[PDB]
């Protein structure tokens, strides 16, 4: 019955993804349920014959199959989940329309766009309108988001289905909201909008008027352009939008609770409220947000990513660690370190780069692992991990890792020189790790190792089992293809290498434990997306606690302002 | 209040007035009363640099000054009058907004064109909304007529000044009606319709949306053609108009009794109804429609125009004389006879289309005068009207003929062969009519001979007298810029030409009358456009009653359906 | 027969003026003439009911009536000038059309816009094509500027006329180059340019084909966008401009010299090039741009302008004045000091604005003096020009100034205290200047004191006249509305109130100088505007050197890199 479009962004990977959930968080705090579908206005599916990481962060979060990139936020804000009907893109409509012309339902007639493109979109909102989450029966309200990039040349159709829901039912059941960046001068200083006269003339030349405020900016600029935007679209001049988001998420409620808007929306669509202390509940989001900004620590942390500039390996990795590190009072600082000038692209060029990144992992304290794209980088990561593990410095358990985790290994503890690197050029003899799919049921043939599987662990006692509650099968996924081989894995038995997890089989072994060492996690899952503010994730949270062991800071505080 | 949008057509001489004038009516018929206010896409008035005639019929029907061009058949149909605020176009809004920019009101701030535009039409909206006519206080509903040109880069503004009335208000108060001609090909057979897909685009580019049904015809087409327009315009299928018009005004009202329009008005904007019958008053029109066909006499009908098309010399004319025809039961046969070439550009050319124009005019019984156009015809207009005089056949008083008639009556009766035509080389010695403008009150300088006149007869017993039920001033205008001269009418007086009417001052011998004829009419004004179905006109009346005085015909019928 | 466009900038007040300026000075230091013809797409003059200043820096840099606003640095960098016949907007051009179409010369014809507006602005471009300055016979290359804005609702018929004289001559004649500013990030730091991107579809849109590359910047990017905009333009990869102009006029030369542009030009329009050291002669800009950057002074110089940001006021005065200055090689440092916050605005309010401002201009050197808009701010200024003179500080002669400078001396050396502001409330007894228009030949009535005007001394031995090499008649322009009266300078001649310059019927006293102060200069002319590089402004330059008198510095260099 209720239907509210969301507008991201110009481009995947600008910041469109703290905008969309928080209209999503808004009903979810006054007594009421929602979704999230999107729609990807490119050509196919991202996770087909793309790179693995380049410009979307593609992963595995509760999922069977492949995912989008802009879906992790929703899941540990919100309470609902995403399934395989929830990543709607050009390729998975397209695969339905040639089938369909093909068969024969409409006598074969040749068609164009109107009124068969605009309908079949109607197909895909009100099948997903009374089937939501496990959580909810049927949400009253429906909102569609609109990720990647907006206006191009698939964007006619796009005008002409959002109007036939509209036009059926009353003008109290939708609100047009674009998009209008606001750019920032050099010379002057004045902020003087021009996407904002420019998304208007867009509009109104195809069918549509805007009414909502949009608006984007990092501080609380003067009162001298509020006005200015009021005239333009002809709306209430109380109602202009100031967010001044920077890099986090609590610059959102702050706002509405001094402009006016939570209780606009209200009486717009005819909709019901739990009333208690200002329309939604506030002290959930105010107990983590001024608690945040009152811990420090500036420890030297030394990171490995994959380039200089800002990737898509850590988007939604450094948001949710955060959070879940407000237990222990204590701030960890990320750096720049790039793993392709490392190796000997830099000490047989200038050993001016290559000198001062040593001097801040030696002396630091948690050390991860990157990842691998083909053969642009394979030497550096092997002793980016052998000097930690002889430093009495301890790892955790990062996944793209368990191919040079046995390389250091058995050159170290033995001396396997021919035991290299096996997923570029697969020749040498004591290949460990190799490619092999799944040959059980399910996925048959040449596929991806992923998917909803049963992780059944081995031992007890450890550091990756015991925040659980000590539990028996947990549910977790994956996101690697190459397996590991049980018939080269007898040298790993008769030394201190044990493994406190395995599957169902007992053949595949998806984590390992070194013995001896005071901590050191590794395993293949990512527990990084699974980062809940109220579940911290077991291994970055249990190498704080095992450092210093401060559990009396709690007793000191004894809450001041009371 | 109520303010409703009247779009004509797309270029000026098409049949725009019938259609306009369809809405004009429909709430004068049930006891309300509104006003007629109209705009040019054009330049500026046709009546200033423009020739008199070739494109747009313009009159003095009413008016001190200059008028428009579809403004005669209003004042006929309904019961309001045009004067000097109703004739607005394009020149007349740029004579105030460059004299507002340059002494300063607005402190002289450089805009571009909003809101300064958009608010200056609103001045001519709300001070005609309350200034009707002589014969009402204030009409409640006030409607625009949309004239000239339909689509043009000057028409951005108007777009942006029609939804600013609209979004102030309720929605129960304006619907937007654009334009969709229905061409028919000669080839195929399916009415298949373009601009009306075309129209519904250009709509959508400016950001408006239609609601009503726009179409035109002349035949009754099949149904398979009426449900097309509703599926592309998201309106109901039952309530399209087919209309078929030819070339009358009785082709409309048969047509709102059939689909069901006249109530739909009525429940859309709340207003008030007197039903009697059929929401309004029908018995009126029925009365003149159904006996305009039952009559018929096929007479010889000789009328001089311009050229062979359709041009603007008559397209007002021969509507309004057709309807105070109906008294006399008798049909006048209109021909094509062309002034242009029939002097020595044909006789000495080819002589094809010159004996054959005086085969129809020979045996005639009314002949008319046409007028001048700068040197393009004076020596046919002059044996065209003695030639009717000799053969004791009647003629008609029509304008733009007194500079003729003066010079066949002094070759007949005297023998002045130097009197020629003066206004194109005044340079003879008898010139008798010259060029001399208004010397009194009002009108300084060089001028025109127009507007608001007394006129005064002089005799008593006549042919344009005793039908307006013996007066003594009737308010007459004129449309011409020659007068008569006081001292060269010497040899009118001693011979039989008395003057059966003069004006305030006796000098100006405006209406003229030769004895022993049996009905000789010449004057200047034109009492063609006061042609009211009530009130015949003087001249063409008299012919008819007093060539076969038959009135014993309405004793015969003796009402048939009764 | 050579017509190169010029475009400037999309607001009138960002730095399109030295971006123009480097294609005019191109031809003329290769041996050849042009002019400088720009449109304003404005209403009309800005001069005429808008504010005298506020956004367009308006003067009388040799004109006898109203100038723009970018055309001081033509006649100061090239060696032409501009008349009346240069100052062409949109409201000049409708003077005349709607003449045209009034009196009658295309018989009065209803037409639209084509082909009548665009053959419009031929007349306006083939006249000034033969007719240059004074200075040249014919200019061969006629370029066209393009001021203010770009790209609106006028725009239009621009376009169709630019393709007119393309497509009647060959393709060697023409370059096409439009704007696309380069905005900089505030969170990643890759220079992703939008407005590149779109201005390729709205030249494509219309009829266009970009041909150049069009680019802004202030430092050195790297050369990972170079080849971006190659692409999507199908241009030369070797011809990207990186320009990185930051807010002078030295930044544009040293880059022809390092891509290759200065002879690209020649071979594409089949012009004629004067070789000697580099196409073009160098050596004059690099004297002038090498020396500039080798002198330092850092004096506190307390300046009085209007606002706090970038106004109209000083962008054009102060790049003038510092190119004269390098005769002493001292280096004047400018502040911010706002009139308006200085009155009973700020002691009234908060006193901490108020302190900090007489800690600047008590120590200082050179005091200048503002001007007068309105009344907003007249009791300020008279304070800070009392205070200087007490203090032994000389003055500059800055005009807007003379009805404060006779307040001040009234109510010291004597006591009249009747004598206030004029411009304001013209009540007083004792008022002094009053607004006595010309009553002279040439204009009549209440118009504005300037124009073409003969300034005649009448002393000898000054500051302002010895610079001139002893002049008698130098001609000088104003700009103010304000005179003197000769009845009520009684009081100024009995004490030491010279006047060293008069006019032509002395009676109107121009410029006046006190007796006993070491450097007093007063006037009412503009010396700002005509400070050439060649010749030194009188006022500023002899205040430096009457202050330390150091003319042994040329013969401490003695070229060391020579």
């Not at 089992?465 to 099968?473: A, I």
Request: proline fraction near 5%.
């Amino acid at each position: 019955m209720k239907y509210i479009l969301v507008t991201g962004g110009v481009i995947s990977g600008v910041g469109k993804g703290v905008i969309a959930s928080s209209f999503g968080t808004l009903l979810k705090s006054c007594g009421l349920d929602v979704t999230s579908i999107k729609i990807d206005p490119y050509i196919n599916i991202d996770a087909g014959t793309f790179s693995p990481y380049e410009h979307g962060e593609v992963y595995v979060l509760d999922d069977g199959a492949e995912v989008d990139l802009d879906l992790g936020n929703y899941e540990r804000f919100l309470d609902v989940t995403l399934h395989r009907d929830n990543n709607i893109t050009t390729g998975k409509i397209y695969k339905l329309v040639i089938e369909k012309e093909r068969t024969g339902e409409y006598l074969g007639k040749t068609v164009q766009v109107v009124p068969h493109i605009t309908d079949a979109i109607q197909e895909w909102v009100e099948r997903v309108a009374q089937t939501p989450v496990q959580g909810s029966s049927k949400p009253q309200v429906c909102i569609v988001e609109l990720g990647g990039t907006i206006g191009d040349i698939e964007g006619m159709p796009f005008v002409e289905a959002f109007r036939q829901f509209q036009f059926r039912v009353k003008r109290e059941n939708f609100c047009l909201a674009h998009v209008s960046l606001v750019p920032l001068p050099k010379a002057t200083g004045e902020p003087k909008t021009k996407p904002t006269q420019s998304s208007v003339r867009e509009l109104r030349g195809c069918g549509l008027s805007p009414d909502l405020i949009v608006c984007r900016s990092e501080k609380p600029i003067g009162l001298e352009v509020k006005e200015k935007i009021s005239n333009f679209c002809h709306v209430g001049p109380d109602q202009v939008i100031c967010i001044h988001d920077l890099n986090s998420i609590y610059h959102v409620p702050l706002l509405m609770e001094q402009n006016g808007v939570i209780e606009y929306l209200n009486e717009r669509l005819q909709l019901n409220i739990d009333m208690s202390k200002r329309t939604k509940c506030l002290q959930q989001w105010r107990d983590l947000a001024r608690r945040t900004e009152t811990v420090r620590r500036e420890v030297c942390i030394a990171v490995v990513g994959k380039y200089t500039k800002f990737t898509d390996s850590y988007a939604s990795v450094v948001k949710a660690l955060q959070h879940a590190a407000l237990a222990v009072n204590r701030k960890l600082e990320l750096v720049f370190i790039e793993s392709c000038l490392l190796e000997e692209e830099t000490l047989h060029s200038e050993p001016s780069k290559y000198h001062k990144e040593w001097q801040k992992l030696c002396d630091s304290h948690g050390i991860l692992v990157p990842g691998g794209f083909g053969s642009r980088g394979m030497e550096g990561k092997i002793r980016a991990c052998q000097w930690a593990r002889e430093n009495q410095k301890p790892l955790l358990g990062i996944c793209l890792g368990l191919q040079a985790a046995v390389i250091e290994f058995a050159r170290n503890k033995l001396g396997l020189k021919d035991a290299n690197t096996t997923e570029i050029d697969p020749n040498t003899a004591n290949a460990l790790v190799i490619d092999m799919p799944e040959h059980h049921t399910g996925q048959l043939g040449g596929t991806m190792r992923l998917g909803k599987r049963i992780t059944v662990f081995s031992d007890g006692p450890s550091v990756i089992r015991q925040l659980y509650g000590n539990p028996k099968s947990v549910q977790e996924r994956h996101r690697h293809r190459y397996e590991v081989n049980p018939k080269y894995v007898h040298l790993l038995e008769e030394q201190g290498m044990r493994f406190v997890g395995t599957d169902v089989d007992k053949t595949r072994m998806e984590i390992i434990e070194l013995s001896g060492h005071p901590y050191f996690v590794a395993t293949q899952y990512h527990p990084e997306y699974l980062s809940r503010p109220l579940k911290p994730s077991p291994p970055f949270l249990g190498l704080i606690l095992a450092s210093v062991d401060r559990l009396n800071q709690y007793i000191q505080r004894g809450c001041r302002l009371s």
